[PDB]
Amino acid sequence: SDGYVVKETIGVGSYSECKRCVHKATNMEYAVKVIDKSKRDPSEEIEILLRYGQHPNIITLKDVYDDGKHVYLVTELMRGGELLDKILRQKFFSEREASFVLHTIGKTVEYLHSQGVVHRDLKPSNILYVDESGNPECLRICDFGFAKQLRAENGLLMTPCYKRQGYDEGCDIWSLGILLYTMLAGYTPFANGPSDTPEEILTRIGSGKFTLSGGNWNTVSETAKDLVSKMLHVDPHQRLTAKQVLQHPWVTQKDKLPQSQLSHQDLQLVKGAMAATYSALNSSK
Amino acid sequence: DGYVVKETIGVGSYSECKRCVHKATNMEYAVKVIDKDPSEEIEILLRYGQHPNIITLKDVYDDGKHVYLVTELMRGGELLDKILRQKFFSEREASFVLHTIGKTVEYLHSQGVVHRDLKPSNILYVDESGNPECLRICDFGFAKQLRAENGLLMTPCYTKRQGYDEGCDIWSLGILLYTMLAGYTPFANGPSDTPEEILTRIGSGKFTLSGGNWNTVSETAKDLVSKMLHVDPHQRLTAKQVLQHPWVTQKDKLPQSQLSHQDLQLVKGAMAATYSALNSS
Ligand SMILES: [Cl-]
Ligand code: NA
Ligand code: NA
Ligand code: NA
């Protein structure tokens, strides 16, 4: 407030608005998440970011303010925009580059799960690039407002080390699964565009069925299909763990992966179908 | 100063503990005065200090020269004072002590924390009742949190030095167990034992589990002690395995007769000499 000048708005949720701000002292660009305390308690979000925000692929918390009415999360500015914008447009993209994306993200989720943290909102729009390079190491997971830290009755933090978290972890993997599905197919598994109704989408999701043939799937590697189908398994307690995903041949034997560009559908269609899919899911939640 | 400092309770080669009284609420606390890096100690206490059996951190001050750790006052004094004197004590009560402590260690280990200084004088009672739930683990100045190269906290699960370090925590539990059962320490006879006598005994990996009192101690307790004190550190039990031992899980089968013990000052003296020998090495 006294040390940042607020610029344009980047995005905006029902409890918070993210905007671009500039540090006065050093004149460097950052992002501030402005949260209305009198509507939400970001308490767990702030703790998680302070504790695990040092992980290279988790957005970094750089300053926290609480003038009383609002809470201000200052973080690194994601200049590279969202994942999908990148991989569906500017950037050369084959199974090889996709495996790196999954590996970077899946590795960060595996770390989080091991610490007893579930994200619960791993939609593609929450995965951003810190810069315009499109390099895997530049990926950041960016919105921990639904994230939950596993706790004992008396508040004690706990690790899976020491059925709701197995259900919650499965949700993080399912999200990874549809992102994977999209990167490979160039379309989303349960929606055809932004105008799909919750009815169409939830029926498809409920059936536990999705296409792994036709279109790109006709040239996509058999082991990628194997992996996607185990990440998207209908019974949440039968999906792979993050660890098992990282141990899949599609992730570990990258030199065997095809290196030809992947076909994809219009970017606005794909992001639209993706938003409709998570809107449908929030509905039944 | 929101506290008024009273008498001194104890000392340490890097600290001095005294009883103080909170001014605002007029309640009694304990302050540890440290001569300035309690950094890793403070982090651990803030993070895990909510565990019922870990001392609770209530306030932290740093005027520059000294650091002030305000914690709960341990009115029950040290473990051994209690169980060797002013408390009825059989294998049943011993199993409760191990269970309370071993449970708190198992939690710590799972979080990537090793204590490294689990001597009986670091285990206190919050009050004079001698109840198990009143046990507190109290000094984390050697404790170490498992971390990645980039500072990331890590648990043993995600992730040979920690298996070695955990084995040291279990070994300490083992000699405490040994003492509660035998009424004397396994590697020293009194406060006058030399580091050479003690380390030779420890090094041999041998100790008495027969004759004398041992003839009336339960077989399963002997079995457990011998696996906690195993000479090869990577062959001792994990904390988890200790809590899964029949001596800990089938308490209704334990004997309930008072345990023989030696003079209290002799035992605490031999215990101090034992850890003094170990710090030396
Ligand atoms: Cl694509
Ligand atoms: Na980071
Ligand atoms: Na979809
Ligand atoms: Na506590």
Swiss-Prot record, chain B:
Post-translational modification comment from the UniProt entry: N-terminal myristoylation results in an activated kinase in the absence of added growth factors.
Subcellular location: Nucleus; Cytoplasm
Active-site residues from the entry: D117 (proton acceptor)
Annotated Protein kinase domain residues: 3-248
Cystine bridges: none
Modified residues (Phosphothreonine): T155
Positions contributing to ATP binding: I9, G10, V11, G12, S13, Y14, S15, E16, C17, K32
Domain of life: Eukaryota
Job of this protein: Serine/threonine-protein kinase that acts downstream of ERK (MAPK1/ERK2 and MAPK3/ERK1) signaling and mediates mitogenic and stress-induced activation of the transcription factors CREB1, ETV1/ER81 and NR4A1/NUR77, regulates translation through RPS6 and EIF4B phosphorylation, and mediates cellular proliferation, survival, and differentiation by modulating mTOR signaling and repressing pro-apoptotic function of BAD and DAPK1. In fibroblast, is required for EGF-stimulated phosphorylation of CREB1, which results in the subsequent transcriptional activation of several immediate-early genes. (Microbial infection) Promotes the late transcription and translation of viral lytic genes during Kaposi's sarcoma-associated herpesvirus/HHV-8 infection, when constitutively activated.
Family to which this protein belongs: Belongs to the protein kinase superfamily. AGC Ser/Thr protein kinase family. S6 kinase subfamily.
Subunit structure: Forms a complex with either MAPK1/ERK2 or MAPK3/ERK1 in quiescent cells. Transiently dissociates following mitogenic stimulation. Interacts with ETV1/ER81 and FGFR1. (Microbial infection) Interacts with Kaposi's sarcoma-associated herpesvirus/HHV-8 protein ORF45; this interaction allows RPS6KA1 activation.
Record protein name field: Ribosomal protein S6 kinase alpha-1
Primary gene name: RPS6KA1
Span within the parent record: 416 to 708 of 735
